């Protein structure tokens, strides 16, 4: 099941400011465990570092980006996340949020 | 029902050259088959292409994983368009990496 978070890139290090109900269910984390943190806590031992750097660069480009990256639930179970990030702008054109949608595509 | 611009590259050859190009690629980008075959697809890039998007692709390829990025590209005639570029690895029946496929999708004219 699919889920989504918003980060605030005007704060240092893109803390999560919104997390959909399904994110808590699918990952096992509580609201208090997620809000205010950077979403990289979903990565783990087998997460490919080149995909991590690819996400970092896509954010610096402020552009829509999708990548298949291995993530982990609170219980340690692993899943391929088809992660879809997109920028969200205010009416004046300023970057306001990143939205990032987690899509489990297979188990690991 | 839209046309499907796509290229396949050979990562067993230096710099991931194009080894196949769909008919729609030639129509959409303005390049001829002879201008394209055997070259890396970065020739679609130009002056206002974002370098971080370029590096995100380079990393996505190193990760050997499906990924997609919106990146500004240029046709042969110099017109600029945002390309929603969808790249995936292609495996042989034994599961070994064989090709990369990269589909071009104009989503905005500059
Ligand atoms: C809105 C948003 C959602 C994100 N979701 C995930 C995610 O679900 N899984 C993941 O591995 N990384 C996710 N990231 C990426 C990390 O937060 C971070 O940008 C990435 O690890 C690269 O930065 P780093 O090298 O400093 O870790 C997300 C980023 C943003 C902005
Ligand atoms: C199969 C395939 C298709 C590609 N299609 C494009 C494209 O349509 N437009 C683009 O700007 N880059 C495209 N690329 C990316 C570039 O070829 C190159 O990988 C990227 O610029 C990062 O490499 P670099 O830093 O060495 O240039 C494609 C790559 C592959 C493997």
User: Residue A46 corresponds to which tokens in the numbers above?
Assistant: 């087998």
Q: Rounded to a whole number, what is the distance in Å from the CA of A1 to chain B's nearest CA?
A: 19
Interval between CA A43 and ligand 1 midpoint (Å): 9
Domain ranges of chain B: 1-110
Q: Which two tokens stand for residue B64?
A: 């050997």
User: What are the start-end ranges of the E strands in chain A?
Assistant: 3-7, 16-19, 65-72, 78-89, 95-102, 104-107
- In angstroms, what is the resolution? 1.9
Question: Which listed CATH number (3.30.450.20, 2.40.160.210, 3.40.33.10, 3.90.45.10) goes with B1-110?
Answer: 3.30.450.20
> What is the residue-wise DSSP string for B1-61?
----EEEEE-TTSTT--EEEE-HHHHHHH---HHHHTTS-GGGG--TT--HHHHHHHHHHH
User: Is any Cβ of chain B less than 8 angstroms from the Cβ of A58?
Assistant: yes
> CATH homologous superfamily of domain A1-108?
PAS domain (3.30.450.20)
Angle (deg, nearest 10), helices B51-63 and A49-61: 160
Q: Which of B41, B43, B64, B69 to mutate to test the pocket of ligand 2 (most atoms within 8 A of CB)?
A: B41
Q: How far apart are CA A27 and CA A3, in angstroms?
A: 9
* Distance, CA of A103 to CA of B66 (rounded, Å): 13
- Please state how this structure was obtained: X-ray
Helix runs in chain A, H state only: 21-27, 31-34, 49-61
CB-based contacts of A27, cutoff 8 Å, min separation 6: A3, A34, A42, A73, A74, A102
Q: How far apart are CA B103 and CA B3, in angstroms?
A: 11
Q: Give, as one character, the DSSP assignment of residue A85.
A: E
Residues whose CB is less than 8 angstroms from the CB of residue A8 and which lie 6 or more positions away in sequence, other chains included: A14, A15, A17, A97
């Amino acid at each position: 099941e699919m889920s989504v978070v918003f980060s605030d890139p005007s704060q240092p290090d893109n803390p999560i400011i919104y997390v959909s109900d399904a994110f808590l269910v699918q990952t096992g984390y509580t609201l208090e465990e997620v809000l205010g943190r950077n979403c990289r806590f979903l990565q783990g031992p087998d997460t490919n570092p080149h995909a991590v750097e690819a996400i970092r660069q896509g954010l610096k480009a402020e552009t829509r980006f999708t990548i298949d990256i291995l993530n982990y639930r609170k219980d340690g179970s692993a899943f391929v996340n088809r992660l879809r990030i997109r920028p969200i702008y205010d009416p004046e054109g300023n970057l306001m949020f990143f939205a990032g949608a987690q899509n489990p595509v297979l188990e690991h």
